[PDB]
Structure formats: C-alpha cells, structure tokens
C-alpha cells in the first residue's frame, strides 16, 4: 500500500538541501537502542535528530548516545517524576544559539514533552503531545494543551521561522488514517483533536509539509499499532509531522516517511531544508 518517493534535495528555486532533520517517536529510548535505532540513524547521518518517548528512568543515559560526533549537543526532558513515561531529546551536529524547555505554562511543563532548540534562521520544536487517552478519559485536558501549546508557537513565530516536528497525537484528515470511520471516537481522531490540528496551522500559521507536497498521496502513515501486525498490513496513522512557517516553504526540499526503519511503532520522518 505505500512507497515513499525518493528523496528530493533541491528547494524549488533550485537551492541544495543544507539542513536535514529527522524526528523519531522511539518508543522507548533503550528498547529502540536495543532494536538498532541508532545504526539506522548513523545511515540517515541528519544534522538534527528529535526523539519522542524515551522513557529514561535513572541517571544515566544509554553510552551509545555519547558515540555520536555527528550529533554531540544532545539535549534531553523527561517528567519532573522520571519514571518510564513521556520524555524528549533533540540531537544536534551543531550548537542552537538556545535550548529551552517546555511552554512556559507551568500545568503543561511536568511531562517532558517539549524542547525549543533556536538556530540563526529558525527555531526548532519538538514535541510529543499528549495523547487524548484510551475512553478518551484525557480528552478535555489534551484540549487545554492543544490551546496553550497553539499560543506558544504562535509568539516563537512571531519572532523567527518555525519548523515543529514530532508526534503530535492526531491524524489531521481523513486521509490521514487507514480506517477513518472506525476511529471518529478513538483517541487520535476525534473531532476535538482533528479541529486542534487545523487551529494550530491556522494560528501560527504552519504548513504541513508532507501534506503540502503530497496533498493527494493516500497510505502514508507513521504509525501502526504493534497488535495485530498491522505494519505489515499497513493498517496505520499519520501522527509524526514536521509543520512549517509560510516563510520557509520556499527553503522546502522534501518531508520524508521511512516507512522501513525498525526499531518502534512509529518510523522516523525527515525534512530537508535550503536554509
Ligand atoms: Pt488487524
Ligand atoms: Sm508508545
Ligand atoms: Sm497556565
Ligand atoms: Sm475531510
Ligand atoms: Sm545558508
């Protein structure tokens, strides 16, 4: 049902890709480590590297994190009360001006959910969104962050280019999903979430890069749940994103789904950039 189209790294106006970032939901940062994410990372040889869900409980962080020369500023939050849940890293070849933490709202910043990682033209998030919860039980409060999180992006682009990356917990559209009509009322696909999602692009503004470039490609999912196989049956959703500024849609190269690397659930994306 689906193969990524190769790699295109000329912008539009004919600028050569400078910048390649690639973003990752590693269900687990040792578990993924275990499964040869890192190899699979050192063959994508990308300047900045974003991870969701580390699930670090120690400390002490995997030594193979430190044979990274091409990724030695390494940045890292996990929850206040670290243990096994959430938590993020950004894994740069070279020095942002600034890393900061979370969103400035004290109620949205006890997750290890988000890192802000500034560079000369553009500021990079990543983020893992909370998810809305099985019965939906989370739901209102996914609602509130969806807010608040909406509003902090909307002052850092105010301010510079943005580039957001990260599973962001929702399959905008219909085309998003394998089963769409099965899904209107399961976590990932309500109709709170799906409205979360086109504010967000509506307020900053932000595009959705893969979606921009692709607008009509069904099938491209980043996700697949490990029950059932449905990797294989590419039975998934599109959760993972790298949204943009307007301003840098014309720096855009290519918004990529490896939809063959192992290691998760999820399989990473990666954006190429003529910064
Ligand atoms: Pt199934
Ligand atoms: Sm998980
Ligand atoms: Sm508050
Ligand atoms: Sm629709
Ligand atoms: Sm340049």
Not at 32 to 59: H, R, Y
């Amino acid at each position: 049902l689906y193969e990524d189209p190769p790699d295109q790294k000329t912008s539009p106006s004919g600028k050569p890709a400078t910048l390649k970032i690639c973003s990752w939901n590693v269900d687990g940062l040792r578990a993924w480590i275990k499964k040869k994410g890192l190899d699979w990372v050192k063959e994508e040889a990308p300047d900045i590297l974003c991870l969701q869900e580390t699930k670090c409980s120690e400390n002490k962080l995997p030594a193979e994190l430190q044979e990274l020369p091409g990724l030695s500023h390494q940045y890292w939050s996990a929850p206040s009360d670290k243990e096994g849940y959430s938590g993020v890293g950004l894994l740069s070849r070279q020095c942002p001006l600034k890393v900061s933490y979370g969103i400035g709202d004290e109620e949205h910043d006890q997750e290890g959910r988000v890192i802000v990682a500034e560079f000369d033209s553009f500021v990079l998030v990543t983020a893992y969104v909370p998810n809305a919860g099985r019965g939906l039980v989370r739901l209102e409060y996914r609602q509130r962050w969806d807010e608040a999180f909406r509003k902090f992006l909307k002052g850092l682009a105010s301010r510079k280019p943005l580039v957001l990356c990260g599973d962001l917990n929702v399959a905008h559209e219909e085309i998003d999903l394998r089963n769409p009509k099965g899904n209107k009322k399961n976590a990932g696909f309500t109709p709170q979430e799906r409205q979360g999602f086109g504010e967000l692009l509506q307020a900053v503004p932000l595009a959705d890069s893969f979606r921009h470039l692709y607008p009509n490609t069904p099938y491209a999912y980043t996700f697949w749940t490990y029950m059932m196989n449905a990797r294989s049956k590419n039975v998934g959703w599109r959760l993972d994103y790298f949204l943009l500024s307007h301003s840098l849609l014309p720096a855009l190269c290519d918004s990529k789904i490896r939809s063959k690397a192992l290691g998760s659930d999820h399989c990473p994306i990666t954006l190429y950039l003529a910064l």
